[PDB]
Amino acid sequence: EFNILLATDSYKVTHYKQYPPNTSKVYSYFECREKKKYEETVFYGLQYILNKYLKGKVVTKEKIQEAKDVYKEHFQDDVFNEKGWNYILEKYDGHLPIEIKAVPEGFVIPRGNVLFTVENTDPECYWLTNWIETILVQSWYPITVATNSREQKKILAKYLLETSGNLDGLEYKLHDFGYRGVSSQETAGIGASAHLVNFKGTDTVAGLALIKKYYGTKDPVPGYSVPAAEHSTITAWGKDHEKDAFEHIVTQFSSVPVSVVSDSYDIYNACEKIWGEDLRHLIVSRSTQAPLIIRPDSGNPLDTVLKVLEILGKKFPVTENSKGYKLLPPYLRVIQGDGVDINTLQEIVEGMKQKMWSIENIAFGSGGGLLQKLTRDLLNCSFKCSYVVTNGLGINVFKDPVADPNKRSKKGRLSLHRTPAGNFVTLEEGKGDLEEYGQDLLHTVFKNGKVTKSYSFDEIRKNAQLNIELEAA
Amino acid sequence: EFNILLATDSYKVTHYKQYPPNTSKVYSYFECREKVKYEETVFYGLQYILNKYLKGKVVTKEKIQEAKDVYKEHFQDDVFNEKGWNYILEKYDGHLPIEIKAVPEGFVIPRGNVLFTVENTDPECYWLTNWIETILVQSWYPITVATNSREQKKILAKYLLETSGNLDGLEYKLHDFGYRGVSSQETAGIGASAHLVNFKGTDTVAGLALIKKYYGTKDPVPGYSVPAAEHSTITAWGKDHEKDAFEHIVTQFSSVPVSVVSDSYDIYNACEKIWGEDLRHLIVSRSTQAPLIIRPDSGNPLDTVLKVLEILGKKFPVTENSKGYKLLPPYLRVIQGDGVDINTLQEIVEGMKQKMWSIENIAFGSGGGLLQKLTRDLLNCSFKCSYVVTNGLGINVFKDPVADPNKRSKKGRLSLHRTPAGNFVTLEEGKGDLEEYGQDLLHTVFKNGKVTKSYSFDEIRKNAQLNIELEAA
Ligand SMILES: O=C(NCc1ccc(S(=O)(=O)N2CCCCC2)cc1)c1cc2cnccc2[nH]1
Ligand SMILES: O=C(NCc1ccc(S(=O)(=O)N2CCCCC2)cc1)c1cc2cnccc2[nH]1
């Protein structure tokens, strides 16, 4: 079972001996620190952590003894605030005397703004605020996945709008292929759920249960997929029988969309000769609601996409849409799901545009790029103490390393506000109390072991919409 | 609760319908595909997956119903293999009729070798082999962390031996700071455990319980830490009281090692004037078993380390070791734990060597670089079907994409062997059966719901030792 006493960086076990004597309050905050582009971030994932790890009775006698036993060996020394933890157990029935205030989930906030704050609600538990730094800072991950996914949606929206005149199907244009490529089952669920803030297509099934448990949707599920082959279901037929494999598969899934990986041996041959000649009669008969989606999976992504489209455009009836861009017939589409990240996605859609191919023709699958190739440095997600009370006096505290002004942290009690022009500003040094800037946008989401404010996945999705979506009404 | 029926890529739900009719066996394998660094990989982490997720009764009536309900909404259609999963439940009491063979954990194997194989043991369950691809492929993560950690150990060993003449303390020279910088709690434990294959220093407490539960050590714990400050325990004292914080902290931890982050405002001032003058008397009085470890945490890593050492070298009594390199007194050391990855580690130790500073003086901490900034592409960890039986005939199968020969997969039944020169070779097409290369070095580790062979963490560490450690001993 999970033990919050064992869920911190080892050194934090020793910090209760290090703060100034007579310190009754430690107040800390999280931001995606500005760096002298990901100019705005989607705030998402805290509610998962609050419910899974922080709420309710998280301290027990057994957990205290377990931590004591572990740390004695880990440090080869007895340092461990058994008294402090036993206080929480006795006084609060093991509930954390912590208050967390946060911007609503799904909110899109520029870099360098307070996103949430943490403070102890009992003077005895001054040490607890930063104990939980480690677990709270892991919110960097769903924030970063959601943010990077949204930035890809902006790119897709721009090019889909330009090449087609509308945004139909935008929410299915970037599909999560990342289940195998992340570091754990837990990561899979978290990361997949973050992608679903922006899109509705996923193969990372773990995301669905997480959303159902911690967030909730009006719809039965938040994400969808369709049948598709993998290399094993093609290659199992034998090298000389790729055509047999293709035929069997599209016939099995004749009335739903089906994607078939086509590069097992020679993608160009498969497109031109197998799909474009031998099995063409099985493709041109398909419903618009049940297209064949051809999947290349190797070679230079842009070069391969363009050559696949050129091949298909010569074997199937291509139209020109009202924007002047080429469009495959509705029973035929392409998905590129190899080597896709935010940079290559941009390269591919731009290359398609240059060659007059509509983005209507293609969807993207992304695995490691979407869910694994991200770090806490991308948005500089960081937790710092900004205010303490010692001997009954509040003092504004911060770091400001001489050799790196980018690591300077904020001072004092913080609040987040709308500016007169409708932007965001973080007020420092308790200046929000002056009330010159309207209401603090941070809301209490956790207090004394209870989750006090929750958001549905539908609300989060609404908050995270693109402007271009808002503009398209 | 975890449900293996919901722990696969969505499209795999539909694959049972796509294999050739009358297929009785699907046989697949995992390798770190060859493409130059990372020439050899540490095989580690499969045992965790087998025990946590694959063994025992993993199918229940309730789990089948849950999957059925989820997939009906997810696909907007009924495509789920209820019958196939029910068969496993009825016939094998929900134990997976799968056999997995693997190289021993901790083994160091060159790229492009078979590391494990998977096949079904019941003809009805031909579809099961690749169902579990997704969860098995996640072994890429502990393999990659362990491998990259070991590659850093090689660098540290080279430079420690060169500058000091021995490898004393090598196993404490790279400390895991990655807990806050990984994507989940589960990942933290897995990744920390993989680092501990090579080193004994960690702050990622999650790794300890994982090792104890799934692997085991003779020692009470597999990893260790010491007391240390963070910026909040310095800055809380107020900007004008950095000296007071430092004094309090080293006095609280007067008889054990203690690390104190020294860059909150001015690292160079802290080293030269606070440590080197005002508090010098509290440092030179300390035991060799209880050094102060000064932690810079900002600026260019190499430049900052060099400047820190030059400062300390003028304030404290430096010696010259038997190799001619400069050595701080034993009560004083440095740890650089900002911006450290395998590349910057190399740059720092090389820069120190050029300036005649012993590697004895320094240790490194690494967080995101150690545990998060890694993907499945680094070692090309990949799972592929290589053999099938259909209509009673075995067929050697593979992919070989025309535009990427690096993605060609192996053909047929595989086995791992020692060559006459004592190296590893992977034999394809069942050629292991010819017995020209001795016995297969893979061991059956899982069969029909049971783990059949396992390794303690102590054995894994032994298997993963560096040659230079083996030669030294
Ligand atoms: O093909 C796969 N999944 C199915 C899939 C096919 C096509 C689309 S689509 O976006 O073209 N589309 C969505 C709206 C309905 C029209 C088709 C989305 C999803 C798949 C490949 C892969 C590789 N690695 C890991 C996991 C994987 N799953
Ligand atoms: O200081 C920290 N931990 C304690 C620590 C200090 C020094 C060493 S050491 O290797 O120098 N050493 C071990 C052999 C005995 C002599 C000292 C190892 C461990 C710490 C910083 C940090 C930042 N981010 C996240 C987590 C973190 N923990």
Q: Determine the Cα angle at A248 with ends B430 and A242, to 5°.
A: 50
CA distance A231 to A263: 8
Do A305 and A382 belong together in one domain? Answer: no
Do B59 and B127 belong together in one domain? Answer: yes
**Strand pairing partners for B319?**
B327
Answer whether B229 sits within 8 Å of A133, measured CB to CB: no
- CB A7, CB A71: distance < 8 Å: no
> Could you say which of A20, A205, A228 has the minimum Cβ distance to residue B14?
A228
User: DSSP labels for B59-107?
Assistant: --HHHHHHHHHHHHHHTTS----HHHHHHHHHHHTT---EEEEEPPTT-
Do A335 and A388 belong together in one domain? Answer: no
Do B147 and B100 belong together in one domain? Answer: no
Nearest of B132, B135, B144 to residue B193 by alpha carbon: B144
| Largest separation between any pair of C-alpha atoms in chain A | 84
Distance of alpha carbon B281 from the chain centroid:
42
- CB A299, CB A342: distance < 8 Å: no
Write the CA distances from A373 to A144, A324, B338, integer angstroms. 10, 36, 20
**Strand pairing partners for B364?**
B174, B336
- CB A12, CB A75: distance < 8 Å: no
User: Does A9 lie at the interface with B, CB-CB under 8 angstroms?
Assistant: yes
The resolution, in Å, is 1.6
CA distance A299 to B403: 5
Distance from CA of A162 to the nearest CA of B (A): 30
Give A14's DSSP letter: G
Nearest of A249, A222, A50 to residue A136 by alpha carbon: A50
Ligand minimally distant from the alpha carbon of residue A260: 1
Do B277 and B344 belong together in one domain? Answer: yes
Which tokens go with B460? 């894994």
First to last CA, chain B: 47
Q: In what order do the strands lie in the sheet with B258-261?
A: B174-176, B362-366, B332-336, B292-295, B258-261
Helix (H) or strand (E) holding B144: helix B140-164
Q: Which atom of ligand 1 is nearest to the CA of A169?
A: 14
Torsions phi, psi for B202 (to 5 deg): -150, 145
CA distance A442 to A421: 19
Long-range contact set of residues A76-79: C-beta below 8 Å, sequence gap at least 24? A76/B224, A77/B227, A77/B256, A79/A13, A79/A14, A79/A17, A79/B227
CA distance A161 to B453: 57
Give A378's DSSP letter: T
CA distance A261 to A269: 13
Coil, helix or strand at residue A25: strand
> Could you say which of A20, A137, A238 has the minimum Cβ distance to residue B180?
A137
Interface test with A, best of B30, B50, B180 (most A CBs within 10 A): B180
Nearest of A188, A99, A411 to residue B8 by alpha carbon: A188
Nearest of A98, A146, A164, A129 to residue A444 by alpha carbon: A98
Which amino acid, B76? Answer: Q
Write the CA distances from A214 to A210, A450, B129, B387, B407, integer angstroms. 6, 14, 32, 42, 40
User: Does B252 lie at the interface with A, CB-CB under 8 angstroms?
Assistant: yes
Do B326 and B220 belong together in one domain? Answer: yes
Find chain B residues with C-beta within 8 A of A223's C-beta: 74
CA atoms within 13 A on the CB side of B158: 11
CA distance A160 to A157: 5
Which amino acid, B20? Answer: P
Write the CA distances from B85 to B14, B49, B133, integer angstroms. 13, 20, 16
CA distance B357 to B350: 10
Write the CA distances from B310 to B317, B323, B355, integer angstroms. 12, 19, 10
A203 lines ligand 1 (CB under 6 A): yes
- CB B203, CB B176: distance < 8 Å: yes
- CB B46, CB B116: distance < 8 Å: yes
Distance of alpha carbon A22 from the chain centroid:
40
> How many beta carbons lie within 10 A of that of residue B74, not counting itself?
25
Choose which residue among A8, A10, A11, A399 to substitute to test ligand 2 binding: the one with the highest number of ligand atoms within 8 A of its C-beta. A11
User: DSSP labels for A125-155?
Assistant: GTTHHHHTHHHHHTTHHHHHHHHHHHHHHHH
Which tokens go with A148? 């990077």
Per-residue buried b or exposed e for A197-222, using 16+ beta carbons within 10 Å of the residue's own CB: bbbbbbbbbbbbbbbbebbebeeebb
Give B49's DSSP letter: H
Do B352 and B332 belong together in one domain? Answer: yes
- CB A175, CB A153: distance < 8 Å: no
Find chain B residues with C-beta within 8 A of A229's C-beta: 11, 15, 18
Write the CA distances from B341 to A64, B47, B174, integer angstroms. 35, 27, 10
> How many beta carbons lie within 10 A of that of residue B366, not counting itself?
27
> Could you say which of B12, B203, B388 has the minimum Cβ distance to residue A10?
B203
Coil, helix or strand at residue A224: strand
Q: Indicate left, alpha or beta for A117 from its phi (over 0: left) and psi (-120 to 50: alpha).
A: beta
Which tokens go with A96? 């954390």
Q: Is B180 annotated as a binding residue?
A: yes
Do A425 and A365 belong together in one domain? Answer: no
> Could you say which of A182, A203, A224 has the minimum Cβ distance to residue B11?
A203
Which tokens go with A471? 């503009």
> How many beta carbons lie within 10 A of that of residue B21, not counting itself?
7
- CB B220, CB B234: distance < 8 Å: no
**Strand pairing partners for B389?**
B25, B394
CA distance A392 to A405: 31
Answer whether A232 sits within 8 Å of B385, measured CB to CB: yes
CA distance A386 to B348: 32
B402 lines ligand 1 (CB under 6 A): no
Long-range contact set of residues A389-398: C-beta below 8 Å, sequence gap at least 24? A389/A23, A389/A24, A389/A25, A390/A20, A390/A21, A390/A22, A390/A23, A390/A24, A390/B236, A391/A22, A392/A24, A394/A25, A394/A430, A395/B238, A396/A428, A396/A429, A397/B232, A397/B235, A397/B236, A397/B238, A397/B239, A398/B235, A398/B239
Find chain B residues with C-beta within 8 A of A76's C-beta: 224
CA distance B124 to B297: 58
Per-state percent for chain B, helix, strand, coil, to nearest 5:
40, 20, 40
Interval between CA B271 and ligand 2 midpoint (Å): 18
Which tokens go with A134? 């480690």
User: DSSP labels for A62-93?
Assistant: HHHHHHHHHHHHHHTS----HHHHHHHHHHHT
Interface test with A, best of B1, B11, B211 (most A CBs within 10 A): B11
Which amino acid, A5? Answer: L
CA distance B277 to B473: 43
- CB B150, CB B464: distance < 8 Å: yes
CA distance A452 to A450: 6
CA dihedral A142, A146, A151, A156 (to 10 degrees): 140
With both helix axes pointing from N to C terminus, report the angle between B61-74 and B82-92 in degrees, rounded to the nearest 10: 170
Q: How many secondary structure helices (H) and strands (E) does chain B include?
A: 17, 18
Per-residue buried b or exposed e for B409-427, using 16+ beta carbons within 10 Å of the residue's own CB: bbbbbbbbbeeeeeebbbb
CATH code of A158's domain: 3.20.20.70
Which tokens go with A209? 């249960």
A416 lines ligand 1 (CB under 6 A): no
Interface of B with A in 302-331 (CB under 8 A): 304
Write the CA distances from A377 to A142, B367, B416, integer angstroms. 14, 11, 41
CA distance B203 to B192: 9
Do B249 and B163 belong together in one domain? Answer: yes
- CB A195, CB A146: distance < 8 Å: yes
Write the CA distances from A54 to A46, A49, A96, A447, B357, integer angstroms. 10, 7, 7, 10, 46
- CB B364, CB B175: distance < 8 Å: yes
> Could you say which of A138, A191, A228 has the minimum Cβ distance to residue B180?
A138
Q: Determine the Cα angle at A409 with ends A406 and A414, to 5°.
A: 135
> How many beta carbons lie within 10 A of that of residue A429, not counting itself?
15
Specify the number of domains making up chain A: 2
CA distance B314 to A411: 35
Answer whether B267 sits within 8 Å of A205, measured CB to CB: no
A53 exposed, middle or buried (CB, 10 Å; 0-12, 13-18, 19+)? middle
Which amino acid, A42? Answer: V
CA distance A164 to A325: 7
Helix (H) or strand (E) holding B269: helix B267-269
Give B15's DSSP letter: G
Do B366 and B427 belong together in one domain? Answer: no
Helix (H) or strand (E) holding B32: strand B23-32
Which tokens go with A48? 């998962």
Give A20's DSSP letter: P
- CB B312, CB B267: distance < 8 Å: no
User: DSSP labels for A288-328?
Assistant: TTS-EEEE--SS-HHHHHHHHHHHHHHHS--EE-TTS-EE-
Three-state SS annotation for B203-253: CECHHHHHHHHHCCCCCCCCCECCCECCHHHHHCCCHHHHHHHHHHHHHHC
Q: Where are the alpha helices (DSSP H) in A215-264?
A: 231-235, 242-252
A412 lines ligand 1 (CB under 6 A): no
Nearest of B92, B113, B103, B111 to residue B47 by alpha carbon: B103
Q: Is A376 annotated as a binding residue?
A: yes
User: Does B226 lie at the interface with A, CB-CB under 8 angstroms?
Assistant: yes
Do A310 and A407 belong together in one domain? Answer: no
Which amino acid, B152? Answer: Q
B35 exposed, middle or buried (CB, 10 Å; 0-12, 13-18, 19+)? exposed
Do A94 and A109 belong together in one domain? Answer: yes
CA atoms within 13 A on the CB side of B415: 16
User: Does A32 lie at the interface with B, CB-CB under 8 angstroms?
Assistant: no
Q: Residue B419: which residues within 8 A CB-CB, separation 6 or more?
A: B425, B437
Write the CA distances from A225 to A97, A194, A200, A263, B3, integer angstroms. 43, 17, 9, 21, 19
Residue A109 lies in domain: 1-137+376-454
Q: Residue A2: which residues within 8 A CB-CB, separation 6 or more?
A: A53, B185
Helix (H) or strand (E) holding B135: helix B133-137
